[PDB]
Amino acid sequence: YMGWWGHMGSPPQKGIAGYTISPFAARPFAGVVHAAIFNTFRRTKNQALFVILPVSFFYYVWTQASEKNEWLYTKAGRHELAKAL
Amino acid sequence: ATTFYNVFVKRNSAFVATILASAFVFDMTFETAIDNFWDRINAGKQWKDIRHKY
Amino acid sequence: MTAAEHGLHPAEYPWPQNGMLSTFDHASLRRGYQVYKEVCAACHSLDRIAWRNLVGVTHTTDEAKAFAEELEYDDEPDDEGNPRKRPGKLADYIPGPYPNEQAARAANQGALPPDLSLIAKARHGGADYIFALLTGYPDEPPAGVVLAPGMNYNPYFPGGGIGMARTLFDGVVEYEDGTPATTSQMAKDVAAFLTWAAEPEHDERKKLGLKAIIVISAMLGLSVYIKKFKWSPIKNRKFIYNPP
Amino acid sequence: MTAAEHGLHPAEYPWPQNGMLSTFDHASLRRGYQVYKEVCAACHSLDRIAWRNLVGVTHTTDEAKAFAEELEYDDEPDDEGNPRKRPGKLADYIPGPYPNEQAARAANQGALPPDLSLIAKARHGGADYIFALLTGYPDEPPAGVVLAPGMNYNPYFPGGGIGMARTLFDGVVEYEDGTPATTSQMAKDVAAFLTWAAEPEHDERKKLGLKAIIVISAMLGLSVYIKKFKWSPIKNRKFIYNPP
Amino acid sequence: MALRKKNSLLNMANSYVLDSPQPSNLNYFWNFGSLLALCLVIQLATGITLAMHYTSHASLAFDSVEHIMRDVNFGWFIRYAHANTASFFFICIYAHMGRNIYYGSYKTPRVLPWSIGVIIFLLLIITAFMGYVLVFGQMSLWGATVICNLVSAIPWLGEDIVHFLWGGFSVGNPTLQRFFALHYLMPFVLAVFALLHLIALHTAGSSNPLGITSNVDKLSMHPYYSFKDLITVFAFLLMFTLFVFFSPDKLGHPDNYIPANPMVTPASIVPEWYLLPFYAILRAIPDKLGGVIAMVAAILILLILPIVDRSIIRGNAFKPISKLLFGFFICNFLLLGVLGQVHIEPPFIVLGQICTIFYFSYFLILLPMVSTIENIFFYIGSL
Amino acid sequence: MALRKKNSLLNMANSYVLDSPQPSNLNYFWNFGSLLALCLVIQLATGITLAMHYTSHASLAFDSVEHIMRDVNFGWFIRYAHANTASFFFICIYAHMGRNIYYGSYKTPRVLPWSIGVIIFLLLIITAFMGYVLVFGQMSLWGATVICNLVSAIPWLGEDIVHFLWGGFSVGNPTLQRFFALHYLMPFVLAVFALLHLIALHTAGSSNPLGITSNVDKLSMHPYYSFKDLITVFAFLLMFTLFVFFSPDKLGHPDNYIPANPMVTPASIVPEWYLLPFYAILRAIPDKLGGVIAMVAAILILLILPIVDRSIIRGNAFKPISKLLFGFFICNFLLLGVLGQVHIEPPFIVLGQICTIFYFSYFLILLPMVSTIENIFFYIGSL
Ligand code: HEC
Ligand code: HEC
Ligand code: HEM
Ligand code: HEM
Ligand code: HEM
Ligand code: HEM
């Protein structure tokens, strides 16, 4: 499934012209400020829900469970604990 | 500044010699500099600061 | 579990050694050794500490040799193969108050006072736990606590009933540096001393960490420049496609 | 080196255990233990042998427990942490005559009688050396030998001057099996016993070796048949060459 | 022809670290492979060094570790480095497995590197469990006791096997000495399997975050990924530094600084943090043997990902529903970790069981369903 | 295409042990390679097992070996197997090196496997020396003392390096514990180099006893050399059996059954038998540093065989004069071995020096001369 240099196993390529400049000729940090602010904000915004939803749900679950557990082992929670066992 | 490149950078033998000599200097000076800094932020705390009583 | 069964969690006190760049206060360490020697050493060993460990931390070579030379240690047998004692040397370990566990328990109504060389690492809380425990004996147990015989109430100890009685009272030690020996002062000093005993590398470790942080930070910054530099041909690459 | 400095090399005696298929004579082992116990044990320890090791070699479980129970061994401290003794158990090691090296040397004009658990492996010659040494004290040292004080002449010992005096004399032991306890008989028995002590696996080892020899021999024979079988196409290959 | 290609030995190195053709778009999550190799190298160097100072006999083991801390020059560093890197090794291995699951690295044609990887993961667990025992503190002993007693569940022979592992009737000297020997060995076995999974991967090449072929656009491993790997090496070393130098015991259990005492049982016997999710899965099943099977199945079930993922598309970059499901799966795995260290009390008992059901249902139900549905949405959605 | 060729992992195995094309005329001296692999496997298995029972602390080491002999089930066998196989490993390695020298396996195109082989030989020596120390009997200690004191000869830093090796001011606990760790490690390093020299060899293929190309007539490694290797495996196991079961201490020094005593110096401090020729070479030079250099040079000089053999013909099968010279060289190497264990007394002092001169002159003078002359005799002789 993968070859090696010169016979990598790409479908034949024809008509793509690729251009680049020397590392010494480029500014390595060109547009870094724009990227660090706007690009990172864009990428983060687009992924936010996929992190926030599961994290917030499982944190809420843990919070409820730890608070119940704490309450069951107080004086006030004696009766509810007796039933729970 | 071409001069600087030509002397210290162009030949890799010279570049590596320069890097190692710089590492030697850095290592010795950084040691001394941190020692002094550490003694100033921890003044009166360390054994060397109370040793004089004994 | 009940809070009682866990023990009350000790406050976070601002120890001199808290802080990325902070050493122990060695004057406090020295005071704390004197508390260990005059109070705790009656019941608790410090078996992992040798006299040489105190030198250049709390005491000069001469003071520590004096401490060693006051004691008798087991020598190699004499020429008739009879046991002999010798005076202590700096390489000797600080000797314990009891010859074995059984003797220790017999002297403490069944409880075994732990070795204190590691106790600051061996309990959640560290210095703070030792300080809280030594200072945290209430005059009277909270109403309704039933102590087992030979137990004392201390909320910081898990379960509440600890076999060690309160031992620090104002002026049980006379510090040689003129510091007022209050319960709180002595507890702070001995807790600092025990923390040092548990992690004697602490001061050196934090200094080497400072050097490491600085060098590694600079290398991280430079590695980012170098990565960006070398990758710019790939990032900057542009294409023109003319379908054939 | 001179022959003296090497020691005379001991004769090859025909021990019952010499021979690929031969075990120790266990009756001799038992007799030899009795010689160890009544003669050598005064000066020499047998520290690597436990009472349990004698069981089913030289003695029954009951005889060996009796031997163990006659002695006192250090117990765990009592409840006041005072030292205690207990009677011996089969798990205990046979105890030495001296508490340390210094006591041993003091009792033997400076010489240290070695532990005998490994002595059969630890000297060139093995059983033969032990037998030769015990039986090889001449009445008079060869004319011209100057013995150091407290040394005895024995040609088998390197240098000739050995700190151990002759100890086996006719009838120092009374064997329980009615065998005449002659110097030579006792030396043979104790030498056999010590050989067993050095290599207690000896009997089992040689039996497993017999099984291994047989299986491995058969496998070697068959591997030759199989090799020849599989190789015959290559060995038997024939060519016809017609230059093109 | 250049020497690095001509000479057979150099050419093997060349094929892996220099001319190796990589996709040109690997993101930073492809850097965990090299971090894991760095952890493995640190563990070998520090581990072999500790072995020069450690004594495996139970009468001396704990004290030999104290001797390393106190007497050996830089012993404190080598000990803490070894102990903390064991934690980082698991952070990196979970990250690496997470990357592989999210980007579908387990799909054809990479089932073999994935499957060998599952074995590497098991060997890492065994290695780290045995290494923990070597300290012979309270957690060392009690952890060994409880974990080795799980083998008692194996029917008929279980008891006999436990006594065989222990070399004894309880955890003690024979167990400690054998774990030393095996703990020394297991990292070399682990290195061999790590190398095998790379060799297996080299037939297909690395996957990439788009999940398409990279055969069209390759980049030499060096210098591009060499210098990109340096960034995470230095980021890793910064995290390593903050633990090893400034908080060396944050990841540790204090009870392991108390010498092993078979009489006193510690308050709560929990494994090291990285084993906690498996421990929660074990507690979830009431049956002893059931629990053990579930715990093993929680690892071995990874082997069925190649089958149960029915997607026509490799990885999750373009699959919104799969990404949500993956998010929940990961967070549930973390909740299992947390429930592994709580006390067996309400309401965590029931919660642990629900999380365990969610864990298994991801592989057995949800991933097959969601991947089937998304296939259909891509087809109908683009018509 | 058959699976063993298709799958990359299987194909690596296939290329070495199954389809590997071998000359059809290898004789029994080509079987030492597999015997050495068998020794290496036996040493790993027995060694790792001993490590489960051995304690590296100097206070317990000797006693732990006695415990293995006396208490551990089959401990006697595992101990003797490990100790005797160390001897067989050197018999087989000398046989393998002898085969290689006689048949010109060191000539192009096989210089690289030969040269890696010389390093394997050095690692074997170090491995076996450290393993011997672990017993901590009298020979263990005194051998470590005298061998490590050779490093004191290195100018300026020599003394400092010895203290560094020892971890102390004499051989004692620190030395023993570090040798344990390294003795455990070194066999794995040795296995890697053994694998490298095979990979290097695979480019040229095995030489053969005629010294001609075998490209014209090849045989699969299996089944032909598989079944031929079995014969020597069983012959080896028979020899192994006779030592391990019937004479387990024939190759041993009795003094190693006396616990190490730094005060008492044993009568005669000699290395294990397989290092004796190098010890004779060392004694031959009066200068301390000279002696050490000569001893190392006696091994490293093997690296120049590719250069100093000027023959146009590979190996000795057809070279009567070279065969005689080789015979004398081998017998001299055995005489050196014998002189390694005699006392430093007349007339063995002078004899040791003459044998050492003969040893070096083989590589430096005689082989270059004889190989040049035989070239001429073949050319003139066949006109
Ligand atoms: C005369 C007895 C005695 C004196 C004096 C004493 N202790 Fe203790 N200590 C004990 C006993 C007994 C225990 C065990 C209590 C238990 O386990 O119930 C103990 C326990 C402790 C513990 C650990 C409690 C735990 O979490 O297990 C610390 C820390 C401690 N002591 C420190 C000190 C310090 C610091 C001093 C004095 C400066 C001190 N002790 C003085 C008898 C003493
Ligand atoms: C009362 C003293 C004493 C008795 C009885 C005694 N030995 Fe010894 N034995 C020694 C001493 C002392 C040495 C050390 C001699 C030396 O190194 O010069 C020794 C040495 C030996 C040696 C080793 C000699 C060597 O090569 O180093 C053997 C073997 C030995 N004894 C066996 C026995 C046996 C068997 C018996 C009795 C059956 C026995 N001994 C009785 C005191 C005794
Ligand atoms: C010691 C542990 C490991 C090391 C050192 C290691 C190293 C690596 C390296 C260097 C790569 C190639 C670069 C990369 O993708 O990051 C890689 C790829 C891979 N590893 Fe690991 N790995 C280890 C453990 C695992 C485990 C536990 C798994 C699976 C459970 C695994 C599965 C894979 C897979 C599937 C790939 C191919 C991923 C891809 O490039 O698409 N590895 N590994
Ligand atoms: C994957 C590689 C490894 C992992 C994950 C690993 C893990 C661990 C862990 C978790 C411990 C417990 C540490 C503690 O809390 O003190 C430990 C201890 C130990 N490991 Fe390893 N280890 C590895 C490799 C090695 C190797 C190769 C050696 C070589 C001998 C080794 C030797 C030791 C020793 C001697 C200890 C006991 C001393 C101590 O606790 O620090 N380890 N290891
Ligand atoms: C652990 C030690 C070693 C092992 C396991 C080993 C194994 C092998 C094996 C299996 C072969 C191919 C089959 C054969 O010819 O016997 C071989 C060939 C070879 N070995 Fe070794 N070897 C070892 C040590 C050495 C040493 C020390 C040397 C050289 C000083 C060496 C040099 C060679 C050479 C030159 C060949 C090619 C010989 C030929 O086929 O003509 N090896 N080795
Ligand atoms: C090339 C492989 C090896 C060689 C040549 C070798 C050699 C030796 C030798 C000569 C001894 C002295 C034996 C004695 O007289 O009692 C020894 C002891 C030892 N070796 Fe190895 N060894 C090897 C591999 C290993 C390995 C992989 C281990 C794994 C730990 C190991 C563990 C030991 C141990 C624990 C001892 C001490 C116990 C004893 O003396 O039997 N060896 N080894």
Characterize the structure shown.
Chains E, F: Keywords: Electron transport, Heme, Iron, Membrane, Metal-binding, Mitochondrion, Mitochondrion inner membrane, Respiratory chain, Transmembrane, Transmembrane helix, Transport, Ubiquinone. Chains E, F: Fungal cytochrome b-c1 complex contains 10 subunits; 3 respiratory subunits, 2 core proteins and 5 low-molecular weight proteins. Cytochrome b-c1 complex is a homodimer. Chains E, F: It holds the Pfam family Cytochrom_B_C. Chains E, F: It is found in: Mitochondrion inner membrane. This is part of a larger assembly, with one copy of chain A (about 80 residues), one copy of chain B (about 55 residues), two copies of chain C (about 240 residues) and two copies of chain E (about 375 residues). Chain A is mainly alpha-helical. Chain A contains two helices and one strand, in the order E-H-H. Chain A is elongated, with a radius of gyration of 29 Å. The termini of chain A are far apart. Chain B is mostly helical and about 55 residues long. Chain B has one domain. Helices cover about 75% and strands about 0% of the residues of chain B. Chain B is rod-shaped. With about 240 residues, chain C is mainly alpha-helical. Chain C has two domains: about 200 residues, no CATH class; about 45 residues, no CATH class. In chain C, about 40% of the residues lie in helices and about 5% in strands. Chain E has about 375 residues and is mainly alpha-helical. Chain E is about 65% helix and about 0% strand. Chain E has a two-stranded antiparallel ribbon with strand order 1-2. In chain E, helix 14 runs antiparallel to helix 15. The longest helix of chain E is centred in the C-terminal third of the chain and has 35 residues. Chains in contact: A-C, A-E, B-C, C-D, C-E, D-F, E-F. At the C-E interface, helix 8 of C face helix 4 and helix 10 of E. Strand 1 of chain A pairs antiparallel with strand 5 of chain C, so a sheet runs across the interface. The site of one heme C has 23 residues of chain C, from helix 6. The site of one heme C (HEC) has 23 residues of chain C, from helix 6.
